[PDB]
Amino acid sequence: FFQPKDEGGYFYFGELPLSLAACTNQPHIVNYLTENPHKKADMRRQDSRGNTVLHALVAIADNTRENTKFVTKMYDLLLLKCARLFPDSNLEAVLNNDGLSPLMMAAKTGKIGIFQHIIRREVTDEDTRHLSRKFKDWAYGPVYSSLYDLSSLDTCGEEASVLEILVYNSKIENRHEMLAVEPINELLRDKWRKFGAVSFYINVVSYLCAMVIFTLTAYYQPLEGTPPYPYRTTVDYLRLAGEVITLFTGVLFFFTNIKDLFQLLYFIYSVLVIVSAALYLAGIEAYLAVMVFALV
Amino acid sequence: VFNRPILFDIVSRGSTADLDGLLPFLLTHKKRLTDEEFREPSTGKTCLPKALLNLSNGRNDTIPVLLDIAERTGNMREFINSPFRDIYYRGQTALHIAIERRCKHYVELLVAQGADVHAQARGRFFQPKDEGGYFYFGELPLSLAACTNQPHIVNYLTENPHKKADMRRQDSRGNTVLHALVAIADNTRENTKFVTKMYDLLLLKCARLFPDSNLEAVLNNDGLSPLMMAAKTGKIGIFQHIIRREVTDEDTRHLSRKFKDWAYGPVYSSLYDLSSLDTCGEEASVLEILVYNSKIENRHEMLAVEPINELLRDKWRKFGAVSFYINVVSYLCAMVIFTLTAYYQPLEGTPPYPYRTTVDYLRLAGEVITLFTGVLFFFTNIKDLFQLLYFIYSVLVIVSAALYLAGIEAYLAVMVFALVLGWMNALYFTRGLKLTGTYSIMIQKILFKDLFRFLLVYLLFMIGYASALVSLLNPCANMKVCNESCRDSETFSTFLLDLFKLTIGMGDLEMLSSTKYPVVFIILLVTYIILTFVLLLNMLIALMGETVGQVSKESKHIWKLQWATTILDIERSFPVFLRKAFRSGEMVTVGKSSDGTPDRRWCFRVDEVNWS
């Protein structure tokens, strides 16, 4: 009954009385259970699913106005609580059984509201503001040089950066809309005007050149039967230099997909180029038949 | 006192408790606080700007004490003039910072002791946002208060029982406070409201205090009027307001734009001025920059203002359609005459110059006026020193003239180029009446982008597959079974010809079963031709069907844009000083005090209807 609604469950709050009060929006109960002149619980202890109260709080979050308002401030309340009462580490760093951050789980299931808020929020009182996200640098009248943090936004597959789950593994109804947030939409242009178009154009021009070279080596072959390996003369150096770089493109696109252990087509390309390489190494009839498959 | 850091700490704290009794040391060791070593040489900031940079509630009450110290040295001038020196923050006398933080008290003091009412901080930080700049206000303290919307500061700096600045002095970019005020103007409600009235405030100020000339007349380094710069960057709001505004109090209303003539109940014969609206390239009239040089996101919308939209019709119903029809009919006649002289020529070889008989007077009279149209369209574009096509027309007509003057063979070859290119240019007139020129919209996308890239990629596809097939005859032995005319050969490219003939989506090529001739060749051929000839062109057909629904405003908009372009160049083609449109107006004292010109002060009259 307490599992999420995709495992036959009816309501999943987090299997913890503290989180049970949290999701159900009973702040006074939270203040009591966190601290009271008796037994008291720490939001430290995660659940039987790897989650602590924050992750749960994100789970049952929704996008309707009501299911954003209260949860927004409740999250910050409990965060500041854990901060003050544990002013050495932070709660945000703790990961679930899948090792995801609460921000990560916010991204995956596409919870717009809580994510849109957690990306901006800054701690006003500088007493302990050392967990804020948005900063300030200077305001010369009408222009604020605002400064957005990036610490789990981009590390290229080293700690499951959020942008990765946004781009590759996301099949989310709100995947598009979430990208409209400032420090992501801008980061697109930032990675674009540098290292964005340069390598893209390099790759497209090199690919077109390789394909035209394969066409070249195709049309200038000895025709009318008998395809053995004829490389013995200077004019055949052209075909030799074309086929070696053909096999080179093959092994390169092979290495591209073996590192994954339009995502396999360029690999089947390499497979057929290797078929061609073997068949031409044999140098027997009915063996150029795969060169045409490779070209097409 | 002991170092630059200690005093910076003292002042950033905000209490002179650590500064008291330091001035007798300063005088003791002749330490003049003006000295530069107490400035971090990275930029040059001194005690005062570092002080004012830190502000609690608007009061860091050691500042007057520090200035007392400066006068204990006996120096304020060197002190209060300590401009920042680098490429990021250049100049920027402390007064700029004080005004930016907006504590009119410290403003009062600094100005009273007297800093300067001029410091042109040209640090790249202060450039516009298209030269790496972050904020461009106008390099003048007065304009700095203006843009930042601090009216009281404006009243103080304009006039006060001390040094005071005149909005006369332009910037290091040719601009005075009005031009700047237009620069940082925007189109959002907020960035229109305050700037609207601030502009009028400062304008009336300059008027009253300089009631001989006007500020509006002063031009920037590019010689543009503030109204001009408003037009160019497409600032709708400030422009829409400056075109209507009229000075209510007739004491000095001799700068207003809209006037009144009579109101017979519900009809007001309102009268809009035109003094920088139209002079045909003599003083950079605003309509010119609106029509020719404008590539503005709001170029269309700004035209919706009354005394411009009406002026279109005004120049249309007179001198608008007459010369347009004259030009189109004369052009069609010239082209049909060139066709005439083309078809009636001596054929079957031998094109010398045969003009010796009466029947050849027809060809002579046709070719002379052909060369005349050529030299005319040549003169059209040489005055510029569908804007060069009619000139390349003339170039090729002159090629034809020279080649026929030679009268040798292979020399009529350019007459056909001339005829075909002229009948292509026939589209230039075919963009006016009857909603002609709709194609001229869609050709903007299909010829340059869509059909272009499609034909490129498809040609590459088919040539690659052609190499494939011409290499795919040796196994699957040489046979290309006769189509539904190259036979097995090795020459150079006849393959490509007959193969393209095959690729023609002409007749649904034969089907096979129990293969005897090339076996795996046919399946590749059929799947490829299905790919390219059942999807690609269909991809493009669907692309057309979806892209055609983009015409929203650019039908009437490109229609009146044609109006603008054509009509205005028409005016630009013949003597405008002749009796033309944009008629006269009411006489002096309601037609004087030049933003333009004589007592008539040429205006237009629009008859509005309203009930109230």
Curated annotation (Swiss-Prot), chain B:
It comes from Homo sapiens. Non-selective calcium permeant cation channel involved in osmotic sensitivity and mechanosensitivity. Activation by exposure to hypotonicity within the physiological range exhibits an outward rectification. Also activated by heat, low pH, citrate and phorbol esters. Increase of intracellular Ca(2+) potentiates currents. Channel activity seems to be regulated by a calmodulin-dependent mechanism with a negative feedback mechanism. Promotes cell-cell junction formation in skin keratinocytes and plays an important role in the formation and/or maintenance of functional intercellular barriers. Changing F126L: In FDAB; poorly expressed on the cell surface; mutant channels show a significantly reduced response to agonists. The keyword Cytoplasm does not apply. Residues 344-360, 406-409, 474-491, 512-519 are extracellular. It is linked to Brachyolmia 3: A form of brachyolmia, a clinically and genetically heterogeneous skeletal dysplasia primarily affecting the spine and characterized by a short trunk, short stature, and platyspondyly. BCYM3 is an autosomal dominant form with severe scoliosis with or without kyphosis, and flattened irregular cervical vertebrae. Spondylometaphyseal dysplasia Kozlowski type: A form of spondylometaphyseal dysplasia, a group of short stature disorders distinguished by abnormalities in the vertebrae and the metaphyses of the tubular bones. It is characterized by postnatal dwarfism, significant scoliosis and mild metaphyseal abnormalities in the pelvis. The vertebrae exhibit platyspondyly and overfaced pedicles. Homotetramer. Self-associates in an isoform-specific manner. Isoform 1 and isoform 5 can oligomerize, but isoform 2, isoform 4 and isoform 6 cannot oligomerize. Interacts with calmodulin. Interacts with Map7 and Src family Tyr protein kinases LYN, SRC, FYN, HCK, LCK and YES. Interacts with CTNNB1. The TRPV4 and CTNNB1 complex can interact with CDH1. Interacts with PACSIN1, PACSIN2 and PACSIN3 (via SH3 domain). Part of a complex containing MLC1, AQP4, HEPACAM and ATP1B1. Interacts with ITPR3. Belongs to the transient receptor (TC 1.A.4) family. TrpV subfamily. TRPV4 sub-subfamily. Found in the synoviocytes from patients with (RA) and without (CTR) rheumatoid arthritis (at protein level). Residues 492-511 dip into the membrane without crossing it. This is Transient receptor potential cation channel subfamily V member 4. A motif (Selectivity filter) lies at residues 505-508. The chain crosses the membrane at residues 323-343, 361-385, 386-405, 410-430, 446-473, 520-548. The chain holds residues 148 to 786 of 871 of the full protein. Residues 1-322, 431-445 are cytoplasmic. The modification Phosphotyrosine is found at Y106. Changing T148A: In MTD; impairs protein folding or stability. Ca(2+) binds at D508. GO terms for cellular component: adherens junction; apical plasma membrane; cell surface; cilium; cortical actin cytoskeleton; cytoplasmic microtubule; endoplasmic reticulum; filopodium.
